[PDB]
Amino acid sequence: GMETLELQGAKLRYHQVGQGPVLIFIPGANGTGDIFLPLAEQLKDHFTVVAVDRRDYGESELTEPLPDSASNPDSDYRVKRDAQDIAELAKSLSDEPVYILGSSSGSIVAMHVLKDYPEVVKKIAFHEPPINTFLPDSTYWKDKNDDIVHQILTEGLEKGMKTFGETLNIAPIDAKMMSQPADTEEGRIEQYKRTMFWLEFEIRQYTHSNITLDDFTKYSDKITLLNGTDSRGSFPQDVNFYINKETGIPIVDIPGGHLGYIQKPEGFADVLLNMWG
Amino acid sequence: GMETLELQGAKLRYHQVGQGPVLIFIPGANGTGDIFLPLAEQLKDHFTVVAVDRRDYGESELTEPLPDSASNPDSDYRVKRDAQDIAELAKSLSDEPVYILGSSSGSIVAMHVLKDYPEVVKKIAFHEPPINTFLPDSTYWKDKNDDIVHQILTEGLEKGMKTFGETLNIAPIDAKMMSQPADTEEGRIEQYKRTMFWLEFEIRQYTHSNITLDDFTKYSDKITLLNGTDSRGSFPQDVNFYINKETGIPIVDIPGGHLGYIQKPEGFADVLLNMWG
């Protein structure tokens, strides 16, 4: 089983194995203490090894939502919160100061532990830290860092709905508006989760729904098949062409492309109104 | 404000505007009824226009978790659930059958409405549906569909931690293991959310933490700077080089690369044991 320390705002889960003085390992960008278990196995005879799931990852769970300003690139809430987690964890296990090793972003947490709770630090190791703040060329790296983040949020969205549109033969215009990044940071990540949910839970399950031609001839007099006039050649229109030629349901051409209801709202209306109004 | 219909397992939110017979619009892959508002504005004088947030998107909220088998590419739970939402929505607003238009995946929902609740369907329109099941070449498109999904889950993970590793000058080996896709579907999307959380809430906030050289000289006798021997040249090691040359904290070389604690667990141990044991 996995150990639990209940602290302010989170249930902190850790692995613990061995005998002796306490050795705490703080994980980097992966964030889970399991990456240290093959290391713990070697040291188990000489230290009580503690490998923590930092509070936002793995078996740890938040009992309170992250403060809203945590998304601000400048916030320091999470890194101080993680360091207090480690100090509180050391105090729960040992009456003397403990050994601490951090790697990558975990060594940055380790830097904040020494700075703010040195009383728990007997000895400490910083393994390959990527912090840039004190470097004479800090600005160069901080700006490089902000650039790739903003890139990835924007480029990840459009890269998926392109190979897709390209195999479905949709108009480039149409893929653009569909994978148009939102005008905001949270709205970019907002849109980003939807797009993943749509991938895993919608596209495969719906395009292979159990629908047959008998589901079109049954009430075929109630149906209309709509093709946009800007998006000829796309896979969706070939579907309509097949339904039409096997069932006799008419195809009505309607302005705009695959998003014609919002591309040409007035023309879409006029066709709908002529159809049903 | 936005309207609410409470149904089994979800609070279904919709927009409603206009006068006359009911016109329901079912959104496609974006999943939210707001995409139809410029269209509703044109029809508002001739229909009561209803533009639904399908239950997994937007202002709609699940009151029960999706059934676990929803992630199976073959599941039909969500598409039948969405169609029942529409039938229940039509019944709540109109004593006579209503007009229904679906687009893209929403027209696939519309196909399931006609099939299962035709009593609510007065007239119905399928706008450019991407369903392939009944086509003579179904298999060709279904297999194309599964391919891009499995691609995107795998290729999205590694594409971000490459431009990153390349600007931080980390060893290719090291980027590989860090953006190594998990051996499972949920574990690929599992790892995938962590990676996004790490982007937005960790990398910028930690690498620009407020740490100065005085946070290294203060208890510098307790500190050790660790560089892996396989990852020379990377940005993290230049950080250590700077700390070392400004403060006198020694650098201990330790086997493995940026993930040496798991790459060379036995060698990492021996160096740690010689250091502190």
Strand pairing partners for A101? A25, A125
**Residue B35 to residue A215, Cβ atoms within 8 A:** no
Of A189, A178, A197, the closest CA to residue A154 belongs to A189
Residue whose pair of structure tokens reads 């919608």 in the numeric block: A202
Please, are residues A171 and A230 in contact by the beta-carbon 8 Å criterion?
A: yes
CA–CA distance, B226 with B228 (Å, rounded to integer): 7
Q: Classify the phi-psi angles of A275: left when phi > 0, otherwise alpha if psi is within -120 to 50, otherwise beta.
A: alpha
**Residue B128 to residue A163, Cβ atoms within 8 A:** no
Report the residue of A61, A78, A206 to disrupt the B interface, i.e. the one with the largest count of B CBs within 10 Å: A206
Non-local CB neighbours of B197 within 8 Å, separated by 6+ positions:
A56
Of B115, B206, B13, the closest CA to residue A145 belongs to B206
Of A230, A91, A202, the closest CA to residue B78 belongs to A202
Q: Which residues in A103-131 are b (16+ Cβ under 10 Å) and which e?
A: bbbbbbbbbbbbbebeebbbbbbbbbbbb
Pairing of strands A10-18, A48-53: antiparallel
Strand pairing partners for B101? B25, B125
Nearest residue of A to residue B34 by CA position?
A262
Residue whose pair of structure tokens reads 């896979």 in the numeric block: A235
**Residue A43 to residue B269, Cβ atoms within 8 A:** yes
CA–CA distance, A79 with B147 (Å, rounded to integer): 39
Nearest residue of A to residue B123 by CA position?
A222
Report the residue of B261, B263, B266 to disrupt the A interface, i.e. the one with the largest count of A CBs within 10 Å: B261
Report the run of H or E that residue B102 belongs to, with start and end.
strand B98-103
CA atoms within 13 A on the CB side of B30: 23
Please, are residues B33 and B60 in contact by the beta-carbon 8 Å criterion?
A: no
**Residue B261 to residue A57, Cβ atoms within 8 A:** no
A vs B, Cβ pairs < 8 A, gives 392
Enumerate residues 18 to 77 of chain B having a beta carbon within 8 A of any beta carbon in chain A: 23, 25, 29-31, 35-36, 38-39, 41-43, 46-47, 56-57, 66, 70-76
Query: B248 — contact with chain A (CB < 8 Å)?
Result: no
Q: How far is CA B44 from CA A63, A76, A247, A270, B267, in A?
A: 46, 50, 32, 12, 73
Kindly list the structural domains of chain A, giving each domain's residue range(s) and its CATH number in brackets, ordered by start. 3-127 (3.40.50.1820), 138-207 (no CATH), 214-276 (no CATH)
Please, are residues A153 and A71 in contact by the beta-carbon 8 Å criterion?
A: no
Please, are residues A101 and A24 in contact by the beta-carbon 8 Å criterion?
A: yes
**Residue B265 to residue A125, Cβ atoms within 8 A:** no
Nearest-Cα distance to chain B for A6, in Å, is: 22
Of B89, B130, B91, the closest CA to residue B108 belongs to B130
Nearest residue of A to residue B210 by CA position?
A133
Resolution of the determined structure in angstroms stands at: 2.3
CA–CA distance, A80 with A85 (Å, rounded to integer): 9
Strand pairing partners for A25? A51, A101
Non-local CB neighbours of B259 within 8 Å, separated by 6+ positions:
A35, A103, B174, B177, B178
Way it was determined: X-ray
Report the run of H or E that residue B11 belongs to, with start and end.
strand B10-18
CA–CA distance, B27 with B50 (Å, rounded to integer): 11
Which token pair is A253?
Answer: 């051409």
Please, are residues B35 and B27 in contact by the beta-carbon 8 Å criterion?
A: yes
- Looking at residue A74, its amino acid is D
Non-local CB neighbours of A148 within 8 Å, separated by 6+ positions:
B160, B163, B164, B167
Residue whose pair of structure tokens reads 């719906």 in the numeric block: A206
